[PDB]
Nucleic acid binder design. Sequence first.
DNA 1: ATATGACGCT
DNA 2: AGCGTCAT
Length: 430
Amino acid sequence: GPHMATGQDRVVALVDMDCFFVQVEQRQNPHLRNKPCAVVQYKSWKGGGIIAVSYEARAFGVTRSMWADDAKKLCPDLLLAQVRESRGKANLTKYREASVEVMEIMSRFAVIERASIDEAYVDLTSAVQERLQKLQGQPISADLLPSTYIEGLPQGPTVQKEGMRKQGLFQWLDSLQIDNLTSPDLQLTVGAVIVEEMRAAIERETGFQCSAGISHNKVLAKLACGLNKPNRQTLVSHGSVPQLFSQMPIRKIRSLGGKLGASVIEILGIEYMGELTQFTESQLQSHFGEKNGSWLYAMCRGIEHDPVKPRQLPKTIGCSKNFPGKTALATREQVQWWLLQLAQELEERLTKDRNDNDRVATQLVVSIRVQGDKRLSSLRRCCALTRYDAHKMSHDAFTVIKNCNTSGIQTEWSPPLTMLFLCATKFSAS
DNA sequence: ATATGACGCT
DNA sequence: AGCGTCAT
Ligand SMILES: Nc1nc2c(ncn2[C@H]2C[C@H](O)[C@@H](COP(=O)(O)NP(=O)(O)OP(=O)(O)O)O2)c(=O)[nH]1
Ligand SMILES: [Mg+2]
Ligand SMILES: [Mg+2]
């Protein structure tokens, strides 16, 4: 009752760019705008693999991971942009730089946690508090929320999408209690107003559109964001959670899309997030461990406490290439040469990072995958990163992995390598 | 033949 | 330290 925490203490948003790599390419090449478009890596094998898809192209059934040749069967007029290739590998610099454009704008509004190349969490609790004082108990006009959906509304006693959106927003705003500066629903609403402003700034200053979720924690904000993509934002209130979760597959919640979510489903014999409320915290901990059990118990009630970490920069800087099928590296010369290529890209990115961000990496992690191994990494080894020198880094990387070669012959490498991955880590201020 | 980032477990 | 998980 009076002592039961409701997880309504924060206002958290998740902003995620719409078909991000596609928009980067469309901004650069106007011919690609408002068309079925995708971004692909490489070209020779089946036209290249698709990693981003415009919403026009999604309507034809084009998806991530599809070969471009196959996508063209679904969508004959599909337009394609190719990721830059440098030193024989994909070079994502253009998208990293576009990412920085967007992150720097978001950082004007609040503390952000960079969560991927195209999304950040925003802790809006403080910004909301101050905007509420500036408000002076003034009601919030629907005009301040022109792209916002209120999840779960409208309800009770129109046939077009925008009509529905407005009806729900009207019901929400009509019920809002603006006299109470501590109403979590009011706080979320003000959060949504700020996120409209943030999203307008991003679009004005970069040309890129994005979607957002506004809720009380990161998991609900992320879930909310996806509900009305593209170019819209969604408010998920604490009160919306029971109905929302009552038919929400467990795998849709962040961190439950993998083996843990599958075991929840299998062990408990349930399908939906809301069904978790029926178990005690101890029961959940008995099946999934102390940490996961506590997290699940709280999360199925809409409660989560993971903070928005003050971190706009990546923690590691890495370079990797897969060598699939018959391209697997099978000679020592092959292995040293590709380590050199990776290390040259890494050197350029590290030197740039040191100039921009006043820090230096101090450890180099070398990861490989061997043919026949379905794991991401077959083996990781580390060494000291003392110099931003590509020849030294590649030589050192070879030194720490050369043991893995089970070949009796000098020139040969076995088992053949299906991935090389260099990652610079353990940054120190510089 | 579906680049590379954060983080947990031991 | 090195491996496993989840993710975009
Ligand atoms: N090299 C590479 N890039 C990838 C991969 N997966 C995603 N990207 C790149 C490509 C993505 O454009 C970008 C952002 O990932 P999302 O936010 O999950 N998808 P998007 O923004 O495209 O569409 P929307 O959010 O509207 O659903 O990350 C991959 O597996 N490999
Ligand atoms: Mg996106
Ligand atoms: Mg994303």
